[PDB]
Design a protein around this ligand. Structure first.
Ligand SMILES: N[C@@H](CC(=O)O)C(=O)O
Ligand SMILES: N[C@@H](CC(=O)O)C(=O)O
Lengths: 911, 916
């Protein structure tokens, strides 16, 4: 029955049916209910068709018989456009279901009571240290006093920077539906029979509601609002829950005070409407809009919880607040008459409410009108104005003997205010160096002094330092401006006009020089920005990384810059970007080294350095693995301040479920604290040498395939949906489409290519290297974590899918090239297994393996569907006999979009 | 009330109060009930006194405030002889209670579901591989086919040799009481109606009391015969049934890896043996008559056990369908004073007709042994009795086949298969007896012969001359011993031992171990004495090489034996050699013995191979392999490559038998890990040491042995210190070279100081680290990566957890003269430095942080052990110094010193269990 579907699913994932392992059951239950829904909505035949795709696809994943893939192919090419959309919709939705189930399983999986203490424990959610356990290791194993631990945490800073979903920001409505499905599932395993019957019917109903929210592309403004949804869903509440647990952990190590409510321990930021790199749709107007939206939403969140705080704050008992209440003494849900003065905390909070309302309304009018007449004194323009009256309530309760009450909801609110400020996320701006060069070259030519672009690096620096202390402005009204130059100058206009608490960093993409950084500083001074954004270079190519040290050295040598920077500098690294240039192995090692070198240079100059981790690192995986990934960082690269990218495709895993949200915040904080007092071992010299030797080879293999093979590009454009995803060659292609196109094929070339040659050569040069590599794997956190990510990527790989795409889409003369990349994949995988000490992929993480494995049949169905869809899109003369319509003006591009989104939702993070 | 004692116990063992962790509760409950008992039996004041010793002792262990030890001292020296016995009795009994509770805790502790696969997992009961998981690692990780695994297990042999409790063999009656206490405790945590709880509470109470009042200490120590019977008790209690339970699990594991047959009932996988009444080494009370007696007892008990279960098998075997082979046999027997089948069996009950005959035969076998034992002879003839195991199997195999042939395979594989396995494992004698005697006794015997024959003095002869004469007489054409040979009592005792071997059936015996073996000739000497007595089936001769120098000369000695045609022909492809960790460690220090023993086994393995001889290394006491529990499992897997090779033979030390076999689950798991580890090791050897490691180990051995020997043998006043700091002399009821290993370990264990286990490790580590700072890291890698090194360090770490330099310091204040105290002081500094070095090498801050369940177990015992230590210390002052006086309190109990000391010594030994 349900028993039958359960049995089916267990053939792919068998063995240890323990008591907290319910994942297969959850999946069975959801799939069962969804198959009924499909029958009701679309008819028995369609249900049977979906069931048959699933079955065929399961059998192919079980035994890997390519006849099975071909059968599923036949079935799928025969479907008319309409049936084909329903099938793609069905399997995408099954994926979202399996992901909700898996989150529930990770949320309730049992922790290991006794931990071995090896660093490997920190790779796994069930064994990793929580905040208390981290405190205790630091006190007992590293001989820190509890006070020292407390003091470091007080000064610590963790900043999570949210980026756009590369394929599909899940809309607010749907995400809530996903939440309720998950909750109904949870509650079903808590239970009276009638409750079960009712929950059962409520589950059924929510699965359907989700499926039928299934309606061209979205505005960046809307993409921003969709990306902010997780605040409401979890983070908003989660921050105070986690800070409260810090309090408890501090108490359990002998610290008899709460973690101060205004320690800036957690900060969130955003690139959404800020990053315009290679993206001219992100205009100045978009930037202004998302700043106002962030401000609107934050005030609105405070406003919509302040009435609850006012109810709870009924107390009648200090003179400081008494006085304020007396001074102060309509269209709202709760306190719509004047508050009486015998309710003093409500008089204060009543004023805070009104002010919050006015702050929210100004932003709304600024947004939809263009201006508002609402004045500064009616509104909060700075976060201290909002804290102040809340601190007053806190103190008044303490002075009147009610400390204990103060530390309830009021303390929660104080923390939310301190963490989220007036703008939930501070926005980073990002733009590429060449755009700044263009802007300056327009200025220099118009001024008649030559062409900045033609100038040497020394000349650029000399001219920029002279104009950074210039007495005249640079830009006259008659400066002629291309659209691109205007768009870049008007971005600074927007920075000059919006409050500084809207913004974080100005990241320079494709940075290579001292002058790139100075260029942006000059444009900010020219716009007279009261509080210039800090300037952060992103060095992308290997060569750029190699030139970064000399570039920072020079910046830090310049009096004007040192004085401006005030002891602090941030530098950004992008793992996926560097891996596109050099292969992932060589980018990993180079990035390790570069960070060492820049840390040393910072120290020498008495500058505190923050490394901002862009996408594609081990640290962006989420979950347990992020925890060891953080502790693997080179010594002193964190030093009390973490700034990391939370990748769009991981946001749901990290923050969709309340427990996972809590644990994400916890491991980021725990890991940051620990690393500064307990660095991973530094590598043995033999390891460096071998890693250098392996980098040279890995880069040679990767580059010879990706850049020197004259037909690589052509192979890429056929074997991969890259071109269709649009809706020079590889050097010019951006990192996201690179990773994505190969992830859609289940092949992942960008992640593993180069590791094969590195290993083969090392082991062939000297047999003893195998053992050295294995020791590196057991003992060197950096190496372990590097290998693990790639191992996780191979578990999501299926060379049979790549083969099928070759048969359908690649011309015959390219097929053997494809075949040879598949042999490289196999050989690379096997070398990685031998180094990891494993027979099977992920035998060190069987819960992850199970999760990925349950997804495969669904993903595979979408892959097969996609492959034929691309055949049809690409070739209007390919046709087959379509079956008479099975279901009860929408095209092939629509089916492909569903396919791409479904695969990406099942593939989640890779490289 | 009970909540109060619980709180008190948790201060010593705090933290992770999970749901299967009930040890503290068990202990609180037992202590609570026992305090009531003490009130009833001896009065409130005595209860308060016991409570106050406990409390004072708990606080001392918690915070180690020496004021608290001094208070306990004052209290304990004030007690008259009578009060003092009651207190010592009370605290010993508490220990026995805490051990029962701890067993229950180990029995029910939850297994880890997901194992990391590191070998460290096999050090711990909760993570170690069971038999199925061992099968699956061998199939999937070492690429063995299931058939290959099955075939190796079929050919495998695991032999456990049981030795006497060195301090006190627990009598059969008391052990059963301990069992029922444990069961009542178990049942209290099952379900539970309030009246059941009230009834179990009252039953628990009553058993604790029964056990406490089985407390005669008698003038005569126990006869070796009685010591043997007490040592056999565990068979009835657990092992008898446990063997078939475990073999059945092997069946289930085999099935789960795709083998569709049961493990054959007659594969000799498990064998038990004994030294009790067989070892006469340094022990003239173990006479020929004793040996004869325990063989007949072993025979009597075994037949009795079969006899007393055969009636149950007969009831169950009601079936009427038999094959014609059994039909025919039944008809014969139907032509030609018990509990159950006392009328003639009818022939429509064929299986009963067969088993009826087996019963009668068992009875007669049991009775012959009894008459042989109490009369001197019996008229009962061979055909009325079983004289060989195949005769008992035969009719049981017939029943098995008949059921199979009639379609009832499934029934056959129940009780009948269990019985078949018991018969195949225990044979006609539950345990085969090893004989052991020292080489010099044989020399004495041969020297008497040679002088009396007028051909000179065997003792004066060189090794080459010994060999030459022995090989000529081993092919001699006349006997050596004439009627007029004059015989010292010792020579007679040794000759008459061979008489006893000549006369008893060969299935009574296993090995003739030669203690203090050094030579080829030592082994040939025993072989000549056996041939002279015309023993139809001579026991195999097994040398025990004890000193470092002996271990170093063993290779050349085995080479020579294996080179001699006469010996090779006699040995028929098989040789056993014995090693004794405690013995070697007495000579050379435990570190250097551990390393040397590792090397010597490598070298003898190689030599055996070269000569095409299968080698069994028999592990004497004192090794890592003797710890029991989880640690035994990694200990076995740590063995040097090919030192097991399908055949394990290890000592189960008397002080560990209770832990290994008293509780049914622990019994099962002991049998399982001995079988799992043995199978695995032959197909999955531990890594061999890197050359740097050997070099360092060699360098460290030189230094450890220098430190150990300079303290133990060259310090002129060491012996004198030892006799005052330690109860060695009183335990009696040359110098150290001449003292036996058991009293050496024991005497320092009684002081909580354990010098024999750690002495020498300090200098080894210090010197390594000072020679080159990089050695610290090498040592740490060895610890993480080299099983042998890990397991060697762990045992010493476990010993330090049992240590308390404060108790040692107190014994010095009370018993050592002023001019020797600084010597004691400097040994304590060595203990600190050694412990700290070990911790640094293990990567630990606290002792046993890698094994917190063990740490908790040892820690819950300390308050009791400490109370006994303090009591012992002042008792020894009183016994030794009649110018020490104290104001005794008026008698506290309601309703001398040597007796208190005996209780003290036994209680401390029970709580210390195994160390070195
Ligand atoms: N985020 C998971 C992968 C996944 O669930 O897709 C990991 O990196 O381990
Ligand atoms: N048998 C334990 C020690 C003990 O329980 O006393 C061990 O060796 O680990």
């Amino acid at each position: 029955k349900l028993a039958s579907i359960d049995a089916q699913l267990r053939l792919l994932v068998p063995g240890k049916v323990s008591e907290d392992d319910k994942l297969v059951e959850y999946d069975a239950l959801l799939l069962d209910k969804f198959l009924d829904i499909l029958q009701d909505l679309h008819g028995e035949d369609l249900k049977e068709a979906v069931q048959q795709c699933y079955e065929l696809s399961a059998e192919y994943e079980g035994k890997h018989d390519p006849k099975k893939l071909e059968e599923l192919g036949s079935l799928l090419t025969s479907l008319d456009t309409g049936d084909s959309i329903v099938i793609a919709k069905a399997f995408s939705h099954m994926l979202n279901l399996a992901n909700l189930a898996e989150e529930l399983q990770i949320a309730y999986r049992r922790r290991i009571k006794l931990k071995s203490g090896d660093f490997a424990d920190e790779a796994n959610a069930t064994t990793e240290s929580d905040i208390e356990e981290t405190f205790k290791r630091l006190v007992h194993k590293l001989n820190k006093s509890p006070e020292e631990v407390f003091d470091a945490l007080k000064n610590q800073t963790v900043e999570l920077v949210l980026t756009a979903h590369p394929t599909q920001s899940v809309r607010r409505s749907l995400l809530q539906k996903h939440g309720r499905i998950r909750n109904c599932l949870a509650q079903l395993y808590a239970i009276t029979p009638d409750d079960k019957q009712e929950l059962d019917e409520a589950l059924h109903r929510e699965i359907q509601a989700a499926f039928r929210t299934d309606e061209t592309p979205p505005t960046p403004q809307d993409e921003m609002r969709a990306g902010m949804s997780y605040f409401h869903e979890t983070i908003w509440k989660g921050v105070p829950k986690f800070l409260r647990r810090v309090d408890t952990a501090l108490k359990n190590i002998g610290i008899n005070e709460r973690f101060p409510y205004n320690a800036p321990l957690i900060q969130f930021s955003s690139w959404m409407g800020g990053d315009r790199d290679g993206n001219p749709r992100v205009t100045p107007e978009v930037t202004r809009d998302v700043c106002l939206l962030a401000r609107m939403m934050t005030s609105n969140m405070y406003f919509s919880q302040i009435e609850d705080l006012m109810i709870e704050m009924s107390m009648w008992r200090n003179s400081e607040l008494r006085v304020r209440a007396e001074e102060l003494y309509k269209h709202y849900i709760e306190f719509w008459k004047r508050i009486p003065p015998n309710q003093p905390y409500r008089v204060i909070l009543g004023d805070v409410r009104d002010k919050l309302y006015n702050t929210r309304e100004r932003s709304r009018h600024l947004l939809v009108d263009g201006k508002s007449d609402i004045p500064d004194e009616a509104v909060y323009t700075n976060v201290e104005q909002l804290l102040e009256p809340l601190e007053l309530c806190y103190r008044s309760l303490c002075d009147c003997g009610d400390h204990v009450i103060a530390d309830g909801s009021l303390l929660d609110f104080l923390r939310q205010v301190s963490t989220f400020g007036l703008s939930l996320v501070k926005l980073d701006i990002r733009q590429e160096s060449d755009r700044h060069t263009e802007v300056l070259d327009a200025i220099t030519q118009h001024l008649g002094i030559g062409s900045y672009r033609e100038w040497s690096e020394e000349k650029r620096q000399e001219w920029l330092l002279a104009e950074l202390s210039g007495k005249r402005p640079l830009i006259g009204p008659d400066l002629p401006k291309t659209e691109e130059v205007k768009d870049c100058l008007d971005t600074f206009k927007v920075l000059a006009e919006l409050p500084s608490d809207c913004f974080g960093a100005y990241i320079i993409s494709m940075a290579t020089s001292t002058s790139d950084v100075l260029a942006v500083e000059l444009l900010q001074r020219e716009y007279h920005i009261k509080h210039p954004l800090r300037v952060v270079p992103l060095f992308e190519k290997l060569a750029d990384l190699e030139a970064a040290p000399a570039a920072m050295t020079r910046l830090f040598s310049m009096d004007w810059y040192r004085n401006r920077i005030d002891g602090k500098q941030e530098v950004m690294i992008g793992y996926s970007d560097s891996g596109k240039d050099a292969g992932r192995f060589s980018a990993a090692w180079q990035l390790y080294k570069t960070q060492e070198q820049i840390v040393k240079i910072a120290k020498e100059f008495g500058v505190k350095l923050v490394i901002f981790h862009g996408r594609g690192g081990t640290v962006g995986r989420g979950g347990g693995p992020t925890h060891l990934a953080l502790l693997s960082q080179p010594p002193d690269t964190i030093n009390g301040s973490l700034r990391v990218t939370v990748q769009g495709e991981v946001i749901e895993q990290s923050f969709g479920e309340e427990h996972l949200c809590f644990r994400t915040l916890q491991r980021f904080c725990a890991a940051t604290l620990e690393h500064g007092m307990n660095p991973p071992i530094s590598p043995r010299p033999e390891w460096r040498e071998l890693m250098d030797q392996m980098a040279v080879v890995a880069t040679e293999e990767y580059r010879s395939v990706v850049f020197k093979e004259p037909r690589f590009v052509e192979y890429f454009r056929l074997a991969t949906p890259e071109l269709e995803f649009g809706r020079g060659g590889i050097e010019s292609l951006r990192a996201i489409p690179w990773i994505f196109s190969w992830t859609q094929t289940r092949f992942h070339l960008p992640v593993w290519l180069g590791f094969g040659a590195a290993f083969k050569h090392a082991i062939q040069k000297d047999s003893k290297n195998l053992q050295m590599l294995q020791e590196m794997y057991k003992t060197w956190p950096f190496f372990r974590v590097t290998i693990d990510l790639v191992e996780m990527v191979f578990a999501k790989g299926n060379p049979g899918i790549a083969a099928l795409n070759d048969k359908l889409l690649v011309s015959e003369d390219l097929r053997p090239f494809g075949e040879s990349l598949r042999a490289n994949y196999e050989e690379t995988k096997n070398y990685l297994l031998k180094i990891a000490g494993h027979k099977d992929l992920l035998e060190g993480d069987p819960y992850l393996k199970q999760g990925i494995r349950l997804r495969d049949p669904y993903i595979t169905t979408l892959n097969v569907c996609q492959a034929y869809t691309l055949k049809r899109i690409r070739d209007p003369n390919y046709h087959v006999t379509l079956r008479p319509h099975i279901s009860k003006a929408p095209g092939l591009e629509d089916t492909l979009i569903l396919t791409m989104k479904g695969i990406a939702a099942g593939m989640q993070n890779t490289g």
